[PDB]
Amino acid sequence: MQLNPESADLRALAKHLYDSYIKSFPLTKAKARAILTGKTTDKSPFVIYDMNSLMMGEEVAIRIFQGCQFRSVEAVQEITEYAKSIPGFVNLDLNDQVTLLKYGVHEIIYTMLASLMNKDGVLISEGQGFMTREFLKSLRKPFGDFMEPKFEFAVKFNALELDDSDLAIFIAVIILSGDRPGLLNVKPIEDIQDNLLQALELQLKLNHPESSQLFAKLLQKMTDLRQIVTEHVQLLQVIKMSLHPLLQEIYKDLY
């Protein structure tokens, strides 16, 4: 591996994407991690770990889903804005742009949800609450099974120890998937993804000397992410059961 015009153009793409990521996403992984380790005086979250702490702290399913889906709108707008900054993206057929985001945003939401999770739980009410994993898991079926696979994904994903620089290229790779159903012009999307993949591979070698197969492990995680999105459809069937209104409100902030 050599330092040359190719590599410099790839480091320039990585920087361009990092900058547009920072403009596009107010809640970064660095900020999330800071909250979870108790640095941010500003945000010291109340921990909800059981029914009693739930009270102090202040189809049911379909209603939750209607809720979170509408609350995703801000994230969807941020990712859409982020996509406009990927070189070539706005030159693609408009329908493909829309198809790429329609499928991609769910994967990106779960990717950025991992930033808000550790093994103990997940940040809620934008940094102000912390819902424990085992409390969520304790709830009655089917609700108890909702978040547990995302924690499983998040623990394995967070163990890769990606930073925001890494994540900005990863997210771009996800957006530019040539296999999404109904794409019209697969080739120009693959052309962009090829370039982003090169940038990601360089980024990971420079930023992660500890793990020389991180590139592959991180691509495999796209498979995991695809599975979690797909599992939501199968959970609609399992569902076809009362739940405390405060837990309903909390679930509407997850995904």
Binding site: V76, Q77, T80, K84, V98, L101, K102
Partner: peptide
């Protein structure tokens, strides 16, 4: 479906 599509088209313009 068309909700998400619409929000994305709005966002893209």
């Amino acid at each position: 479906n068309m909700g998400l599509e619409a929000i994305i088209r709005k966002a893209l313009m």
